[PDB]
Amino acid sequence: SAYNEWKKALFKPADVILDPKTANPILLVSEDQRSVQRAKEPQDLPDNPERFNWHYCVLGCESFISGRHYWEVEVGDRKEWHIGVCSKNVQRKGWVKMTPENGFWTMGLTDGNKYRTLTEPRTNLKLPKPPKKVGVFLDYETGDISFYNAVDGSHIHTFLDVSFSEALYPVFRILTLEPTALTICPA
């Protein structure tokens, strides 16, 4: 397909590894550091400055300050998940609303069938097919963050013409307890 054949020609495939130091204590990062799951109760971890202590979020290890990049995330049959990018300088301690104004550019799924972009106010997305694998695409220069169905190459959503200045991290959020993990596809 055009999506599969062109993605690497236009965007550098990012090797995204989850950073355990950033993960909310209720989250578990897999040994290979590609997958995240949720625990029933928060685990005993230090409250280091890099760690999200309220939001059930985890970041990638590396940030982006220029260029075109992409990564793909297997969401599978999960009924809840949110993914995208956030500023290096987001508030990690306490609560702030996950919005572009607060340095979060994310979309995802809640309650099995409610697809949303986490704008302010939130925008409901109408998708003909439920995505099982999502491609996250960053063009730092043009200020575009795009989301695609990584199987059929269909468009999900684009944050357009954002004035980037700070470094951007891949960000992942899961709120629910379910049998399927959220998994990054390797380069």
Curated annotation (Swiss-Prot):
Annotated tissue distribution: Detected on T-cells, natural killer cells, dendritic cells and macrophages (at protein level). Ubiquitous. Highly expressed in heart, pancreas and lung, Moderately expressed in placenta, liver and muscle.
Post-translational modification: N-glycosylated.
Cytoplasmic compartment spans: 1-187
Cell compartment(s), UniProt: Cell membrane
Origin superkingdom: Eukaryota
B30.2/SPRY domain residues: 1-187
Role of this protein: Plays a role in T-cell activation and in the adaptive immune response. Regulates the proliferation of activated T-cells. Regulates the release of cytokines and IFNG by activated T-cells. Mediates the response of T-cells toward infected and transformed cells that are characterized by high levels of phosphorylated metabolites, such as isopentenyl pyrophosphate.
Annotated family: Belongs to the immunoglobulin superfamily. BTN/MOG family.
Assembly: Homodimer.
Protein known as: Butyrophilin subfamily 3 member A1
Gene source species: Homo sapiens
Residues of the full protein shown: 327 to 513 of 513
